[PDB]
Design a protein around this ligand. Structure first.
Ligand SMILES: CCCCCCCCCCCC(=O)O
Length: 133
C-alpha cells in the first residue's frame, strides 16, 4: 500500500544535507547550489510501476520501478547504482548499492508530511516535504 505517498511534494525543511552530500563526495560548488534548492518530488503509480520525479532549478531526476525488483539508477550526483525500493513498516525504503557502498533513502508520513531520511556513512540527513494540492 503506497497510496498516501502519491502526489506532488515540496521541500520545506532540510537538516544535514551538506553532510550527506559531502559523504557521497559531492563537490563544494554543487553542494553550495543544492543547499539553496527546494525540489519538487512527484510520486505516481500505474499498476505495479511507480515513477518518482525530482524537479528543481538545478538538477532533475526520474526513476521508474516495481516495488521489490532491483533496477539500475544514475543518481543526481552521477553515481551508477543498483537500487531496490520496498515498503517496510509503512515506510518507502530505497536502497542504493555501488562499489560495495550503500545509502538508504527512507520516506515516512508523519502528520501528513513526507519525511525523507538519507543515510550514507555516518551522515544522516532529514528533509521534510509538504503536499501540494
Ligand atoms: C544536485 C544534487 C546533488 C546531490 C544528490 C544526492 C542524492 C540525491 C538526494 C535527494 C534528496 C531529495 O530528494 O530531497
Amino acid at each position: 500500500m503506497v497510496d498516501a505517498f502519491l502526489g506532488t511534494w515540496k521541500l520545506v525543511d532540510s537538516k544535514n544535507f551538506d553532510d550527506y552530500m559531502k559523504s557521497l563526495g559531492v563537490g563544494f560548488a554543487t553542494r553550495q547550489v543544492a543547499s539553496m534548492t527546494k525540489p519538487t518530488t512527484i510520486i505516481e503509480k500505474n499498476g505495479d510501476i511507480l515513477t518518482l520525479k525530482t524537479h528543481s532549478t538545478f538538477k532533475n531526476t526520474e526513476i521508474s520501478f516495481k516495488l521489490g525488483v532491483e533496477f539500475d539508477e544514475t543518481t543526481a550526483d552521477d553515481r551508477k547504482v543498483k537500487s531496490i525500493v520496498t515498503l517496510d513498516g509503512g515506510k518507502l525504503v530505497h536502497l542504493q548499492k555501488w562499489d560495495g557502498q550503500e545509502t538508504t533513502l527512507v520516506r515516512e508520513l508523519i502528520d501528513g508530511k513526507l519525511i525523507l531520511t538519507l543515510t550514507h556513512g555516518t551522515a544522516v540527513c532529514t528533509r521534510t516535504y509538504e503536499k501540494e494540492a
